[PDB]
Symmetry: D2
Subunit: 363 residues, 4 copies
């Protein structure tokens, strides 16, 4: 069977034929892979940047997948498109046992194509129906985004759950339309946060240390989103716009995220950390925590969407085809054939500028 | 009228007779002061450490009070004991308008004896019944603690509201008894957090850079609370006990709270900041935020209890007289007469070692 | 100005020119009406079935209009829908923009009570009561108003079920949860579509075989159907009990007796429609059941602006997900100038009706 | 071993020596019984009013006992109370320690179903099902078991009311909210005490003037009272409508018809007791009311360990806050050795009864 394989924690990736007898099976339903997605986590593993590593000589890469059901089973018809949920439970703790290993208490969950579990960049795999999300054919083209968007659906749900601590966090009109969000860093993560917050009606500002890419300009225009070039810091944004109800660190590209953005966070506000710097140290002034304390601010770590969030992603992706057709059409950056080895190895190893999502097509 | 008066932002305090015509009235019910409490905020103002300051030459100090209703009004009988709520609304925002200025969006709320409002260290004051909490006579002796405990009731309520984001945060027995809390710093704040968490059934560890005071030993013994001397840091506590579900920075006595305690916080855990350092800077390693992100941790600023929390305080104080009589008896450190000027000025200006709560008696 | 007018509580309806100066204005934005929707409440008012210096009231609470000149957030040519129930100005719920929970009952209702409705050539409104309707859902966006009531109703039911320590399924979703929707028409169909969007298993029930639309819904959304002409025993035998039951149309005088035996442990009966006459025997065993198993009965009514905005998102989604069903929800469009056919549809529902639209031109 | 035994569904009860070897053991901690409580459910079982290789079942689900030897968290001499309903081992709710929401109905109930109860000299239990009873509430701590059901019921009602955007009052509390408690006895009195603890205004109602205890509660807790012998019209005229109504004792066959007209907008009717016979006319206007105003009816049952622990806190609080009421909740104590008087109180409630305790000695 053809697979894309890695050997963690070391650098390197191969697209080659492997013995299917050695590849992990997770249930009874046979699924033939049609698309994979690639993200930053894949690049890190490919480049041996995930310094963590059983009877296996290699691990099948990839946790973003759409496959076709090969034979009708229970509820699944031959030809149905499915996406597998990638983080799976530790089998022990109460969160995993209710289908929510995003909140696993032991840290012993499995992550397809990352840790403990062969991923989905292979011709086909067997799965358990309970880990499959149905992908309507009417979203086949952008449906691979359901996996990364699930993370964002869970992150926003959590933010809103947290904000129930505020006796009234709605606006004069009963909505959250008056609430302002700053999305720090774009790429597929910040773009997806922006689109989802705008879906929900909140005002959004996207920020990068640069002028907008073409996709970002389309998002700005079509979703009526604002943009801030933060190349010279955030003083001008605070002076013009003021403070934000929610700030999202989407890309972890600011070594001083707290110092830079807490001053921009408004009373009762939430800073959600999704990306984070992977090296360094910075000074922490005492005024940062004093301000958090005085105004009931919260900082929350944001990670991992689960099956309900995958299903919510599907619904939103479907809505965007009608609400934001121009932007939706721009989110798949390109599709590379599994048979184009040179171009495939290139996109596995490194992002391209402006990239939102690269898909791999199985042919 | 006799009052204790300050002149912010400058240092100094006087116990003297003042013209009652110039003192703030807040409604129709006449209340004769019987007790005041003193806390750290009073010491700061007295010592001109609150560097923030209208037609007034002075401000009546004090936001912790029990008074006696002077004449029967509506629902209040002559002789009834009452405590005033100290933070009051800005009159504009939606949180204030539902009686919750602890979440004020404008920051224009008033704080009795601190900012915009004469406090309650005066022979008597007029109030609005809606700002009064009924203090049962059966808790007259410790009832002054209802004000600081209200802050703690609101802080824990908020923590538990936040933890609803976790699909299951209860234990195998449906309780929170398996959940462990580290209370960093004692004094009246950390003692009250400890007693309340134990009321709720969670396991608690109190921590200071010293061996326990006598009151703390009584709490340890009577409430079955644990104790950790953190003089040499937290490594030995982590090695023996592991990690905590909630950590409370009660006293703000650690310039490196994040660095020191995030490593002790468990998956899905909450760090609640109630105290905070008032000067300095410390290094922030990147690993701190990476850990917050990976395990859905939250940091929350904790401040200000409101009327429902005052009423909850009353109920708990009543329960402690039965559940923890030894500790309850030790929480009022001493009572100083308004007529003992030397001893009164001394306790206004400085805390004593081991102090939980000093009461002023009006005679 | 041309308007469709009524004179509550008296029966009757007229399409006539009226004096624009005596009509209610609600803000600074002039909106030219393009579509109205008609529903059951309109039929009741027109037939004088409700008791609720103006000589008439402009009818209609379902509307889409076009902003005539740019003002603050709204541009010339934007499509907008007004929120129909508005606050009493006194209570805390209305003050946070939620008169669906009004504590005084003194809220206004456009085209019903204290407020001229939207079946008129144009009206002035306040941006705060306007919901933006994307051009991409112009054809079905009139449904955002009735859909809002359903959004609110489902939200409320899910909020109530947070009382259950774990109401999710082994996979973390609500996919294992079963809903019985009693009665279709626009209300039961909208409840069905929305519950299927959320992933719950749905059974639609009526005392008859499916309509053309219903069959489309069944097939396209994988929804189940039960003919209840001879009661529900056979449904209970074959599928067992339901986690949520919705009385959509209020067309069963014995709803409690007939459906509580089909409600499962910890289950919720949501009442949206209700019978408008009569008295029926309540057995003691009904309540005994309700008590032992933490069952809840909840009256469901009125969606507010956040629900209108959620409706917009879902309608957009159904154009992609359920295109065949979505194209069948608008039953017909009647011209404001076709007086004969207009009076006929105001006065009586047509068999099979989901939503009739009035076009202004 | 001496035990109080029954043989369900047959009527009757015996106090006799039984073979300890054939009795249920639930864990490693040996507990010597000191008190049992008796309630309505016990009277029903003894009179064979429930249909629910053992020849008998040990009766009793309300107990306090003393730990005989130290084991893990529990020391020799600690007072403990067992949680009486235990999980089915299959469903997600039971698996998170909440069989009050058991989805299979296959949970065990001590002294009722699948589990020997606690009216026996001693039993073995698992620390996970034991609630610590402080020595300082030994005299009234037997009430922690029925109080737990009330803790859970009020918690559930407040959870449900989070659906209301603002259900608090102008002062941020629930002080403005009014509760009508229909029926007293141990259930209505406990509901009353607990709602007053939370600060809500309470009216107790019965078809009679107050008992001695009730008058003490009225005065000491500032609770209101209504004689409902001639219906509730005069209550509605004088006070208006209620935000929460609790049917505590199920002693009104027309509860819905009689109290829904007294339930206010967004209000909740919580059903704890229920009628055990009969059929009554349900008018259509009842549901119409429920629908227009977001009313909810909720069946209330069974508290679990967190509720037992909350009960302990509140009982401790009432010793300080409401000492006179608290000293009147234990109606009498009957010796396990006074067989005549013991059989009499197992078989029938006494007039005025709140709680009868059995003492083991
Ligand atoms: Zn990825
Ligand atoms: Zn786990
Ligand atoms: Zn203080
Ligand atoms: Zn405010
Ligand atoms: Zn309508
Ligand atoms: Zn209102
Ligand atoms: Zn009982
Ligand atoms: Zn169960």
């Amino acid at each position: 069977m053809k697979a894309i394989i890695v050997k963690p924690p070391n650098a390197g990736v191969q697209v080659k034929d492997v013995d299917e007898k050695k590849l992990d099976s997770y249930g009874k339903i046979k699924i033939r892979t049609i698309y994979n997605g690639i993200c930053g986590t894949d690049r890190e593993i490919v480049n041996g940047k995930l310094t963590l590593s059983k009877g296996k000589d290699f691990l099948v890469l990839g946790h973003e997948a759409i496959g076709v059901v090969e034979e009708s089973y229970h509820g699944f018809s031959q030809g149905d498109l499915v996406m597998p949920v990638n983080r799976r439970g530790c089998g022990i703790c109460r969160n995993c046992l209710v289908g929510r290993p995003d909140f696993c208490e032991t840290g012993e969950f499995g992550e397809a194509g990352i840790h403990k579990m062969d991923g989905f960049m292979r011709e086909w795999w067997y799965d358990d129906p309970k880990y499959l999300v149905k992908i309507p054919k009417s979203i086949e083209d952008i449906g691979i985004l359901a996996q990364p968007l699930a993370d964002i659906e869970k992150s926003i749900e959590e933010i809103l759950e947290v904000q129930k601590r505020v006796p009234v966090w709605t606006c004069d009109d009963g909505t959250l339309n008056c609430r302002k969000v700053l999305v720090v860093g774009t790429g597929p993560i910040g773009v997806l946060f922006t689109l989802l917050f705008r879906t929900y009606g909140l005002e959004v500002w996207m920020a990068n240390r640069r002028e907008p890419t073409e996709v970002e300009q389309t998002v700005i225009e079509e979703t009526k989103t604002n943009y801030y070039n933060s190349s010279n810091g955030y003083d001008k944004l605070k002076d013009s716009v003021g403070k934000f109800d929610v700030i999202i660190d989407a890309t972890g590209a600011d070594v001083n995220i707290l110092g830079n953005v807490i001053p921009l966070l408004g009373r009762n506000g939430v800073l959600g950390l999704f990306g984070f710097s992977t090296s360094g140290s910075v000074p922490l002034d005492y005024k940062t925590l004093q301000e958090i304390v005085h105004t009931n601010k919260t900082i929350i770590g944001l990670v991992n969407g689960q099956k309900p969030h995958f299903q919510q992603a599907v619904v939103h992706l479907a809505s965007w085809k009608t609400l934001y057709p121009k932007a939706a059409k721009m989110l798949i950056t390109k599709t590379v054939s599994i048979n184009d080895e040179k171009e495939l190895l290139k996109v596995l190893r490194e992002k391209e500028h402006g990239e939102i999502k690269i898909r791999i097509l199985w042919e």
